[PDB]
Design a binder for these strands. Structure first.
Lengths: 223, 111, 101, 92, 73
RNA sequence: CUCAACACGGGGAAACUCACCAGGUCCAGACACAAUAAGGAUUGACAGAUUGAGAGCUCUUUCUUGAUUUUGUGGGUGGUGGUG
């Protein structure tokens, strides 16, 4: 304590960003997608959002007891006051961070660019997305850089609904010729949205009326 | 495969397996052409033949500390001098044709 | 009984107001005097970077904001029920401190 | 590195004791915060281990992250200790 | 920057190579068999009678210390 | 270097920043091989000379250190060095 809330709330943010960049670098080979911290009294806890939890949770408790030590050594936590959980991913076909790492590692196995990228867009469409778009930019097959974009569905990128329905991820893939850039935008449809708005702002639905009987039989019914 | 049966199975029939190959005739072999489909249809990340743990460390010295340089060594195997550079300790995906020419040009029998 | 004070600080409006609502709901589940949620003025923390790396282009500026919402509730309670109500309403993004006197 | 032998012992034992070292990318940092030795020694001792195997390093935000591998835990036994001792978080 | 001139006199000079003399640990030996101290020990409590005080010219200098133990005589 | 360079590089530089100039240290050259090497691989130093300098830089002197270093061969690493 003894720190102002202005410096306290900012320091919580930079602590989160340092953790997130650590796990992108460390759990790159396990399909990592994000973290969230739950600052509680008595052992603040950290959850790791990675597809293959059977790999993140190593043999007999290794590979996450190691990461528990690595965090509390670097951030000077007391022992036992931080624990690391790994629940897997909510529908990995719709996360742009996870689908960019999939796009990255498919490129590093020497897959053709047009095949590795059409295999990502069609998987995201299979996952119930309304539109997604993959951009590969760099020196693709020549010495002069170009940019290829692969799209399906539709995407909106205009306003506040971008903050609601767009997930973006940028990845640097390191090649023999140089560096290629991977950009994945995924627009999850608002119909399956659980929280927040559930429709686009200019979408109107009219409740269909039920037709009535004309004469309606002028009379009285009593009790 | 190679003359084990392809003449013995040709006893007055003359057609079993006479179809044409893939058809490059100077582009390299298809030793990973099977694995290229598997990384295409599997919608996750797979690890590409991770590293060269001791075939890097031990065979760099037996090849190059003997007489030679990598600028010389990459010239007789016909690859760029950074290809041998990433076969030195780590940081490569090892393919068969490059690793075969690495073996037959300098003798050390580690694959 | 003892005079207590609970201070809430967060960057999320929706996640904070329901926590204070649970605090007051547990406060008149078993009745005691409220001195209910007094909302402090919101703090806007502004960082104005330029836009870019290197200074080529029109001199365009951005401003980024973090919004700090703060609320304190001044309760009095027996010593037993203090711990349970301070431990049940724990939610991510909301920082709760409890001053003893 | 010259790195006198009584400072390999402090470094190598602590890597055996926990299995992790983080250690603060800053050379000439004057007595690293966990081990009683210099911070330059901690960074350069475990660079020697990494090149031969025995440990894997991650770097992020001016900090290193050292993890003892399974080819290094067996080696670090006869360097410092006797058998049937568990270095890493393998101990339940 | 194209090259270097090195206007300083052409000094690729290096340190003394921790100068390699012959075997030197000798108190003195008499016949059968005793030995007595020469280049006497230090007055340091942390030098437990194992260090040799060099005598350059009117100086007694210890090497267990980094810099300075001066019991001059 | 027209708009789309010229209170712009968040560039209000006393040192630091710092990339430039006159000079002095150090290796922070991992690992592998080979050699030297427990008749010592090597490391550090008081005083004086010397030096901008209380830099053992280097030298005079003779103590200390002990197998991590040194030398050579390949590499490794770093670079506000080049190419936007």
């Amino acid at each position: 304590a003894l720190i102002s809330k202005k410096r306290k709330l900012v320091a919580d943010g930079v602590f989160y960003a340092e953790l997130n960049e650590f796990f992108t670098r460390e759990l790159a080979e396990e399909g990592y997608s994000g973290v969230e911290v739950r600052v509680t009294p008595t052992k603040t806890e950290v959850i790791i959002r990675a597809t293959r939890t059977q790999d993140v949770l190593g043999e007999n408790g290794r590979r996450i007891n190691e990461l528990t030590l690595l965090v509390q050594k670097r951030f000077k936590y007391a022992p036992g006051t931080i624990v690391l959980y790994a629940e897997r991913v909510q529908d990995r076909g719709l996360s742009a961070v996870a689908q960019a790492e999939s796009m990255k590692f498919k490129l590093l196995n020497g897959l053709a660019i047009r095949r590795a990228a059409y295999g990502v867009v069609r998987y995201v469409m299979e996952s119930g997305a309304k539109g997604c778009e993959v951009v590969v930019s760099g020196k693709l097959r020549a010495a002069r850089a170009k940019a290829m974009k692969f799209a399906d569905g539709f995407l909106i990128h205009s306003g506040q609904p971008v903050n609601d329905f767009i997930d973006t991820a940028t990845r640097h893939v390191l090649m023999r010729q140089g560096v290629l850039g991977i950009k994945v935008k995924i627009m999850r449809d608002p119909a399956k949205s659980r929280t927040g708005p559930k429709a686009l702002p200019d979408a109107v639905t009219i409740i269909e009326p039920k037709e009535e009987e004309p004469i309606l039989a002028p009379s009285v019914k009593d009790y | 495969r190679s003359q084990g049966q392809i003449n013995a199975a040709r006893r007055q029939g003359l057609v079993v397996s006479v179809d044409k190959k893939y058809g490059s005739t100077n582009t390299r072999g298809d030793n990973e052409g099977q694995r290229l489909t598997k990384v295409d249809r599997e919608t996750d990340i797979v690890k590409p033949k991770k590293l060269d743990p001791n075939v890097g460390r031990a065979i760099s010295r037996a090849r190059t500390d003997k007489k030679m340089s990598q600028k010389d060594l990459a010239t007789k195997i016909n690859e760029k001098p950074t290809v041998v550079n990433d076969y030195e300790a780590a940081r490569a995906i090892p393919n068969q044709q490059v690793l075969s020419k690495l073996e037959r040009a300098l003798g050390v029998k580690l694959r | 009984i003892i005079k207590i004070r609970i201070t809430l600080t967060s960057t999320k409006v929706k996640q904070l107001e329901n926590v204070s609502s649970n605090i007051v709901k547990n406060a008149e589940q078993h009745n005691l005097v409220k001195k209910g949620p007094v909302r402090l003025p919101t703090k806007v923390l502004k960082i104005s970077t330029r836009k870019t790396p290197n200074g080529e282009g029109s001199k365009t500026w951005e401003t980024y904001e973090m919004r700090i919402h703060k609320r304190y509730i001044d309760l009095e309670a027996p010593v037993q029920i203090v711990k349970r109500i301070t431990q049940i309403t724990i939610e991510p993004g909301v920082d709760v401190e409890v001053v003893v006197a | 590195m010259l790195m006198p032998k009584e400072d390999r012992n402090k470094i190598h034992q602590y890597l055996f004791q926990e299995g992790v070292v983080v250690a603060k990318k800053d050379f000439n940092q004057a007595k690293h915060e966990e081990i009683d030795t210099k911070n330059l020694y901690v960074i350069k001792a475990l660079q020697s281990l990494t090149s031969k195997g025995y440990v894997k390093t991650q770097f992020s935000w001016q900090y290193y992250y050292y993890t003892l591998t399974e080819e290094g835990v067996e080696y670090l036994r006869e360097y410092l200790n006797l058998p049937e001792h568990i270095v890493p978080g393998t101990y339940i | 920057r194209k090259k270097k001139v090195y206007t300083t006199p052409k000094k690729i000079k290096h340190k003394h190579k921790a100068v390699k003399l012959a075997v030197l640990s000798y108190y003195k030996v008499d016949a059968e068999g005793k030995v007595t101290k020469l280049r006497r020990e230090c007055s340091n409590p942390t030098c437990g009678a194992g260090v040799f005080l060099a005598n350059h010219k009117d100086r007694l200098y210890c090497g267990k210390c980094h810099s300075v133990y001066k019991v001059n005589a």
